[PDB]
Amino acid sequence: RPRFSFSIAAREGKARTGTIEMKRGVIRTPAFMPVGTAATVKALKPETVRATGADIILGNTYHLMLRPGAERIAKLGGLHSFMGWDRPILTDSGGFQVMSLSSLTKQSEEGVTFKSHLDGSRHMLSPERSIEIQHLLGSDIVMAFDEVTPYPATPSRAASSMERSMRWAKRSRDAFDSRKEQAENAALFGIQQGSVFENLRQQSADALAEIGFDGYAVGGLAVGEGQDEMFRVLDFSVPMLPDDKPHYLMGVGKPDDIVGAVERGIDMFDCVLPTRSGRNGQAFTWDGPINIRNARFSEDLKPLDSECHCAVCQKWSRAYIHHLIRAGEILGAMLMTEHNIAFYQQLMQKIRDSISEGRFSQFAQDFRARYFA
Template identity: 45%
Template sequence: MFEFKIEAHSGLARASTLSLPHGVVETPVFMPVGTQGTVRALSPNDLKAAGASLVLANTYHLHVRPGEQVIAKLGGLHRFMAWDRPLLTDSGGFQVFSLEGFRRVSDDGVEFQSHVDGSRRTLTPERATEIQWTLGSDIAMAFDHVVPGGADEPTARDAMERTLRWLERCVKRHEELRRTEERRRGRRRNGGEDTSPPPTPYHPSSSNPPPHHQTLWPILQGGAHLELRLEGLRRMLELGSWTGLAVGGLSVGEPKPVMYGMLEAL
């Protein structure tokens, strides 16, 4: 279901394929951003005609409006978007970071004020994982703590450490959801009565695989401090065997040479 295969390489450059529940993605790939469940001014057919094979949607925005339960009742995010190719959902960490002055970060999670109606909401690693599970994306991203590009070493370390702690909680909750869903499906296959409540209001369809066909990717933080990045990467790899991972916390205010240098070093 999830497989990354290098097809060809030349030096550090490589061409690969990433197999996901809704199709195969050839990498390197440009991933259009459909933050609120749509890529502006483009229909799904337009995206396909342009060669798009993977689209990003955002957990925070879809949670705030229209809400993951609404999307689930319509058959999941793929059906909601009329998109039958792979989807990646961002955890919402960056969007919460952008709400400067309207959020409070703690080890438990982030309390913030909705940009839509001003209501107070809380997003935790567990909640971000549950929302993405309900949406039914192919790739879910772990909840992370993003800091500005110019953050000093102590601030960047604090965010990196918190991101790693949050990652462990995301993994635990994702595994709980997967096991619960598999038990429910096992009971139905065996003709037994399913008395356990579903973990989410997800409604699968033939064109929309169940959410346990979802992989979780961690996000590396550490600001513009290479040693922090390398330490975080080492510890992240010790936490699990990932099908992929993301480099986060870049293009958030640091000079472009710093951003490119960090990517090159990693």
């Protein structure tokens, strides 16, 4: 396999299906990437992650740099060896979680300094250091380091942050290219910014295309804007990106968000399963989500979902999983996570097949009618 090759096999409207070939494996698109935080996809062995259908996982740079540490992971042979996942890994830049999780942040044109939320130790990220950390981890797809644009953002502030992000995209490009081993074996994605503003999204797309990346993320969404607005921004934003490279919608999302985003030209997705306020009991089904903690499931012998081919739905009942989650048992988290990630992969497979067969628009309609019945 080559370092990086994206091929589009079939199209329907703005939707595409195809493959990304990389040294560590082939990624089928549209793709969902399970999120590994601190070098683990929560409650799953890597072989189980693979069994669900995942071709690639995401690793969180911010968490990894804090624990166990990037240099340590490099000394130990890299993230793949460390956690036992031998297929592609995309690493984020760490910037988002610095803003959301850390304290005492000091931002500048050079980067950001911050205090760890674990022990208040002082750390730093910059375009150069982020790229270096992702190299030390042995990442296959490296994300350019950008500046977080909060939602909502004024036009001036959105513009300033986008402009800084584009300067940082060039710095990221140069850092990546100057490191021979990384340039020859990994890929680099740029991130479009500009908040909800069409003119800024266009300037950002133009800047990224001029620099040139292996793929293009739509950044700055999934931060509270709501689906209608997100879809509105995608409507104009995705066509601005180079057609012949993958389009990655960072942090998205719910099944219906994924379907609509694919309808708008997105090829790659990631998100973390909810846990707060009993949401860890949320199971996806083709008839919409259910919360397995609900008392109505206490004697329900049916599987989580009636069609799902996952091992959890083959072997255990709603009643059992209800009990485990209510009891706070680790096996509850294991089974819920395996089923939910398997559900997402089955959704992606149905999306890929429907685009390949020129019936994706019909699939989207059928999906929504049932999911929201």
